[PDB]
Structure formats: structure tokens, C-alpha cells
Design an enzyme around this catalytic site. Structure first.
Site, mmCIF file in Angstrom:
data_model
loop_
_atom_site.group_PDB
_atom_site.id
_atom_site.type_symbol
_atom_site.label_atom_id
_atom_site.label_comp_id
_atom_site.label_asym_id
_atom_site.label_seq_id
_atom_site.Cartn_x
_atom_site.Cartn_y
_atom_site.Cartn_z
ATOM 1 N N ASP A 159 0.840 -1.201 0.000
ATOM 2 C CA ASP A 159 0.000 0.000 0.000
ATOM 3 C C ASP A 159 0.879 1.256 0.000
ATOM 4 O OD1 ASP A 159 -2.665 1.185 -0.041
ATOM 5 O OD2 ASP A 159 -2.202 1.881 1.993
ATOM 6 N N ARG A 163 0.166 9.518 0.927
ATOM 7 C CA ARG A 163 -0.208 9.718 2.320
ATOM 8 C C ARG A 163 0.666 8.905 3.273
ATOM 9 N NH1 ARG A 163 -0.992 10.114 6.945
ATOM 10 N NH2 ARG A 163 -2.886 10.798 8.058
ATOM 11 N N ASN A 164 1.294 7.825 2.800
ATOM 12 C CA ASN A 164 2.175 7.003 3.626
ATOM 13 C C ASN A 164 3.651 7.374 3.484
ATOM 14 O OD1 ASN A 164 0.044 5.340 4.713
ATOM 15 N ND2 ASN A 164 -0.040 4.300 2.713
ATOM 16 N N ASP A 177 5.071 2.505 7.249
ATOM 17 C CA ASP A 177 4.084 1.426 7.330
ATOM 18 C C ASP A 177 4.333 0.345 6.276
ATOM 19 O OD1 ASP A 177 3.082 3.031 9.333
ATOM 20 O OD2 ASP A 177 1.160 3.455 8.344
HETATM 21 C C1 LIG Z 1 -1.160 8.513 9.682
HETATM 22 N N1 LIG Z 1 0.204 8.327 10.144
HETATM 23 C C2 LIG Z 1 1.080 7.277 9.644
HETATM 24 O O1 LIG Z 1 0.709 6.503 8.820
HETATM 25 C C3 LIG Z 1 2.483 7.199 10.250
HETATM 26 C C4 LIG Z 1 3.106 5.993 10.476
HETATM 27 N N2 LIG Z 1 4.336 5.961 11.033
HETATM 28 C C5 LIG Z 1 4.973 7.107 11.385
HETATM 29 C C6 LIG Z 1 4.340 8.345 11.209
HETATM 30 C C7 LIG Z 1 5.039 9.674 11.544
HETATM 31 C C8 LIG Z 1 6.335 9.668 11.683
HETATM 32 N N3 LIG Z 1 6.749 10.938 11.919
HETATM 33 N N4 LIG Z 1 5.443 11.697 11.872
HETATM 34 C C9 LIG Z 1 5.183 13.031 12.029
HETATM 35 C C10 LIG Z 1 3.897 13.487 11.952
HETATM 36 C C11 LIG Z 1 3.610 14.977 12.080
HETATM 37 C C12 LIG Z 1 4.547 15.987 12.372
HETATM 38 C C13 LIG Z 1 3.891 17.176 12.333
HETATM 39 N N5 LIG Z 1 2.545 16.929 11.977
HETATM 40 C C14 LIG Z 1 1.464 17.885 11.814
HETATM 41 C C15 LIG Z 1 1.408 18.821 13.020
HETATM 42 C C16 LIG Z 1 1.667 18.678 10.527
HETATM 43 N N6 LIG Z 1 2.398 15.542 11.801
HETATM 44 C C17 LIG Z 1 2.838 12.521 11.663
HETATM 45 N N7 LIG Z 1 1.464 12.980 11.579
HETATM 46 C C18 LIG Z 1 0.446 12.284 10.790
HETATM 47 C C19 LIG Z 1 -0.721 13.194 10.728
HETATM 48 C C20 LIG Z 1 -1.042 13.312 9.253
HETATM 49 O O2 LIG Z 1 -0.023 12.578 8.513
HETATM 50 C C21 LIG Z 1 0.998 12.074 9.398
HETATM 51 N N8 LIG Z 1 3.117 11.154 11.509
HETATM 52 C C22 LIG Z 1 4.395 10.798 11.612
HETATM 53 C C23 LIG Z 1 3.110 8.342 10.605
#
Ligand SMILES: CNC(=O)c1cncc(-c2cnn3cc(-c4ccn(C(C)C)n4)c(N[C@H]4CCOC4)nc23)c1
Ligand SMILES: CNC(=O)c1cncc(-c2cnn3cc(-c4ccn(C(C)C)n4)c(N[C@H]4CCOC4)nc23)c1
Lengths: 290, 293
Positions: A159, A163-164, A177
Site C-alpha cells: 500500500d 499519504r504514507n 508502514d
Molecule cells: C497517519 N500516520 C502514519 O501513517 C504514520 C506511520 N508511522 C509514522 C508516522 C510519523 C512519523 N513521523 N510523523 C510526524 C507526523 C507529524 C509531524 C507534524 N505533523 C502535523 C502537526 C503537521 N504531523 C505525523 N502525523 C500524521 C498526521 C497526518 O499525517 C501524518 N506522523 C508521523 C506516521
């Protein structure tokens, strides 16, 4: 769950923070870790911990352990979200992975779209201004480098989508992921309908290969050069099956060279063996970068 | 129900199965013959080996499909067991690969040791010379350097997984298999304990690299010049972990030059980045092979 000293991190030195988002594995939460870098053992480091949602079964719990034990197997790379440690024996299972300050790729590109050509209202970003063509080709090149690493370790993503992908604060692309378990829909999770990224062989026969991830690289390229467009816009899931085996494919994005678009369609070959390998994608994207 | 691929489809009528040969982690491999598998000569029966499922799960079916479709991507080479065709859509899945009449290398070499020097009671065969042994290593290095260039990691290179055709061509096999969730690996599979072929860094970190594949090449060389010896004779597996990182290594085989044994140890370098590449192994192995007699 058995002990593992090589990867175990003490929960005392770990401080949870504001949540970030959720996925198929549960929720991912911002956190801080003291001494997670053994070289600098008195330093707080920002990390993300993956844990289960408050309504998960043990099927979901073994699927979190089975992603964690696979993250140890395939090693480390610049273009993937790497594992840093885990909390096993007492309380809930925390899985500590790298933190990417700039968020995920799809919304990164959508925020940097030209005025009046936005996806939704949201909030725009003009401190970030707008991306160049050379900007865009190196993001996919980084991802091809990362996908070529995962492929060499006999790992299938199943996948791969914008977005990933995650963006560090030096604009490094990180595939995430990749260790998720495969369990045999119209359910949009995180704003995307995942069936639009599947190769025909995985959509019609539920069989996955490294060549199937190459199909999902192509759509990923289309997401990038449309700055986060949504593939097959507004097409009902019931019609994509018919449209796909009819030979129809997505249109060429503007501000994108022909050789890149002719590389885009070779990923969308009906026969998986006919799609390019990740190794030649890395060779071609490097040559095109100059 | 498996996707089509005309270039590789072989009609099930023209394929007649035979006596079984052996097994691996992927299922069973059985002798068979195929009429017209060679398109240039379309009225000829050719002997082939086909891999199929044993019974095995729905997961085991995906790992055969992804081994078959990964064999199509990495191309062909003289020194590997190549894919010839498949029967996909109309019946059970059959993956047709090359047939090597002389069997695997480990028992091929063991059958050819001198009288009184046997490993076990099996009827023997006609003794290999020094030039015979060095060109056998050269062929295998050529095959591993091809696989490395296609970003392929073997993860289990041992004499039992090398096979010999009827003109003594060495062919590496089972190189496209999928990686699962870690077998204890301390259980004897196919007459060997695979843990004695693993590099320490792959043992202790459970991650495999091209540099570790060179370590198992070194073990492989030791197998050859001992004519099918068993590595680390009589050492308990529980003690091999400490013994390896203590610096102990296998002794120099008789009927083997010093430069080959010091090539064997460079494969067993403690630092992985310091072990030679296959590219350099074939270059040096080329030099030793042509001052043969
Ligand atoms: C749906 N998430 C995953 O599938 C995933 C799986 N493994 C590691 C992660 C991950 C690793 N570093 N990281 C940083 C952020 C982040 C930083 C600052 N923001 C905002 C304030 C703009 N968001 C983050 N936020 C998510 C929210 C929307 O998309 C990523 N997810 C991650 C994500
Ligand atoms: C772990 N093996 C594999 O994974 C594998 C994968 N693909 C193709 C093969 C294969 C290809 N040609 N071939 C020929 C023979 C053979 C011939 C003559 N004998 C003796 C017993 C009379 N055995 C053979 N025998 C087996 C039995 C013992 O060692 C291998 N295996 C093969 C092997």
C-alpha cells in the site's frame, strides 16, 4: 511478549505527547525519549510511538508485534521510517520509530499548490512558497531509492501512496508502514480509497508481488506531479474494475516531461513482469536529475 | 486465480510429471518432462524440474508466485538454476526450472572422495582434481556476482543448495525465495544446520546483506576443498556464537593452497565492510584458475 535487550527502551525515559494521527495499525503519538541515542545518553530526542487504539482486539495486537519484529529484520535506510526501540513487558506496547517534523507528503504538496487551485480550504503555506520541477523529481528519486532497498530485502509494501510518505525537516522522503500484515472495500481510511493504488493482479486476484508495488509507484508519481491530486477523480469503485481491464490509464500531469510520463505508464503495464524493476527506476531517475 | 503472462505460459498437455526429487522451504520439486519447452526445436522432449506445493497454505501459494515472478525479473545466467516456464491459470501452479542431472553439490562431492575417506554409507562414483575444484569455485563466484548486481540477497548459500548439470556446470538455486518471520534455525533442515553458514552480524541482528552473503561464500569454499565436509565439526551450536566473535575460524583444508585459505579468511573478516566483493572474488579467482597446471 519476550524480552529483547538489543531493542528494549525503558518507559521511565519515555514521555508521551500530543497525538499525531492514526492508521490501520492503531494510533501514532508524538513522544520524547531520553538516551534513545546511546551515543548521547543524556539527550532528549523527539520520537513517534506506535500503539493500539483503545478498541483493538488481540488480532490487532499480534499484528502490531508482527510489524515490530519485521522492522528489526530489514535494516535501516535513509528513505524509510526506521525503528528505534520498544516497550514490551509492562503496560501497553509502545513501538518507537523516527519522527518526521514536516508531516506526510500528500498534505505537504497540497499546502504548496498555486493560489486558486487548492484541493480544499484548509490552510495554505506561502512561507513554503511553491515547489520546482527539480524539487519534484528528487522526491520520487528518493522514494525509488527507498523502494529499491525494501525490494532487495524481499519485503512487499502492498500500500504505497503519498499519504504514507513522510517528510523530515531537511525534506528527506521516508516510506512508512511497510511491515503491516495482510488480511484478505468501500471504507475510506485517512482520506483515501486504497483500491485506486492496487495493481490489477492484487485488485482482481488478491496476489501481491514486488512488481505490484511498482504499479503503486506509478500512481505515487502521479500524486507527486499533481501536487497531491486524487487518482481517478470521482470515479465509483464499481467502475474502476471495468475501466482498468479496458486499458484506460490516468492522464499526463501538467508541468511534467514526456520521458517521466512514459516512465509513468511502464509501471502501469498489465503484465507484472513487463513493469520496470526498482533498480532501473533508480538508474533513470538519477540520469534525469541532471 | 493467477494473472496471465503469455511469454511464460506452458501448456499442461505437453508436460508429464515424474518421480519426486526433493524438498525445500518452498514446497516439493519433482522430475517431469516437457515437449516443446525449447521453442527453437518444437518437437523435442526436454527433461525439467518443476516446483509445486505440498498440505501447504494460501500463504505458501503467494510465496511461490512471488518467487516465480521474481525469477523473471532478475534475468538469466549460466551459473544459476533458471526459470523455463510455468503453468498458471488452468490448473494447480507448476513452475518449470532447469534440470541438473548430477544432483546437488554436497553429495556430489561426497560421492567423489577417496576410499576410506567417506562421510557416510552411500554408493560412490572418477575423483576431482585441484583444477576441478578451483573452477568450481570460479563458476559459483560468477553466479553470485550476477545475483549481487541484480540486488539479490541469497541468505542461505551452502553446498547443498548448489547443483551440478551433466557437464559439471555449477548452478546456484533457491535464490528468489521470500523471507518469513524468524524458524529457530537451529533445527536440521536438509542434512545441515543453517546456522553454521550465517555471518555473526546476520546472526545477532537478524539482518542480511551482500557482505554477509560473502561470509557464506567463505563457508561454501571450505565445503568444496574438504569435498563436502561439515563445518565446525562437533561444536555445539550454543557455543558457536561466542566462538565466532572470539576470532576462532576453521582450519586450512588439505589439498588447498595457502592463498586460497587466506582468501577463505578474508570472506570471514570480522568487519563486514572489509570483506571482498564478488566482483573482486571472481577477479582473484580468475587469476588462480588460469595458472592451473
Ligand atoms: C497517519 N500516520 C502514519 O501513517 C504514520 C506511520 N508511522 C509514522 C508516522 C510519523 C512519523 N513521523 N510523523 C510526524 C507526523 C507529524 C509531524 C507534524 N505533523 C502535523 C502537526 C503537521 N504531523 C505525523 N502525523 C500524521 C498526521 C497526518 O499525517 C501524518 N506522523 C508521523 C506516521
Ligand atoms: C533443495 N533443492 C532445490 O531447491 C531445487 C530447486 N530447483 C531445482 C532443483 C533440481 C534441479 N535439477 N535437480 C536434479 C536433482 C537430482 C538429479 C539426480 N538426483 C539424485 C537424487 C539421483 N537428484 C535434484 N535432487 C534433489 C535431491 C537431492 O538434492 C536435490 N534437484 C534438482 C532443486
Amino acid at each position: 511478549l519476550p524480552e529483547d535487550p538489543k531493542w528494549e527502551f525503558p518507559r521511565d525515559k519515555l514521555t508521551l505527547g500530543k497525538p499525531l494521527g492514526e492508521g490501520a495499525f492503531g494510533q501514532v503519538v508524538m513522544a520524547e525519549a531520553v538516551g534513545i541515542d546511546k551515543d548521547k545518553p543524556k539527550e532528549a530526542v523527539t520520537v513517534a510511538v506506535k500503539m493500539l487504539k483503545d478498541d483493538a482486539t488481540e488480532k490487532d495486537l499480534s499484528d502490531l508485534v508482527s510489524e515490530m519484529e519485521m522492522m528489526k529484520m530489514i535494516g535501516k535506510h535513509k528513505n524509510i521510517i526506521n525503528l528505534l526501540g520498544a516497550c514490551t513487558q509492562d503496560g501497553p506496547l509502545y513501538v518507537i520509530v523516527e519522527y518526521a517534523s514536516k508531516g506526510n507528503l500528500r498534505e505537504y504538496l497540497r499546502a504548496r499548490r498555486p493560489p486558486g487551485m487548492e484541493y480544499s480550504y484548509d490552510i495554505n503555506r506561502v512561507p513554503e512558497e511553491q515547489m520546482t520541477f527539480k524539487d519534484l523529481v528528487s522526491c520520487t528519486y528518493q522514494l525509488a531509492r527507498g523502494m529499491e532497498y525494501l525490494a532487495s530485502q524481499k519485503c512487499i509494501h502492498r500500500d504505497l501512496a503519498a499519504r504514507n510518505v513522510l517528510v523530515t525537516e531537511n525534506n528527506v522522503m521516508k516510506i512508512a508502514d511497510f511491515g503491516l500484515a495482510r488480511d484478505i472495500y468501500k471504507k475510506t481510511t485517512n482520506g483515501r480509497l486504497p483500491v485506486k493504488w492496487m495493481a490489477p493482479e492484487a485488485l482482481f486476484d488478491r496476489v501481491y508481488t514486488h512488481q505490484s508495488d511498482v504499479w503503486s509507484f506509478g500512481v505515487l508519481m502521479w500524486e507527486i506531479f499533481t501536487l497531491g491530486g486524487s487518482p481517478y477523480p470521482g470515479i465509483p469503485v464499481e467502475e474502476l474494475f471495468k475501466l482498468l481491464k479496458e486499458g484506460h490509464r490516468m492522464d499526463k500531469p501538467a508541468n511534467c516531461t514526456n520521458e517521466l510520463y512514459m516512465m509513468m505508464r511502464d509501471c502501469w503495464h498489465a503484465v507484472p513482469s513487463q513493469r520496470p524493476t526498482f533498480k532501473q527506476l533508480v538508474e533513470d531517475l538519477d540520469r534525469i536529475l541532471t
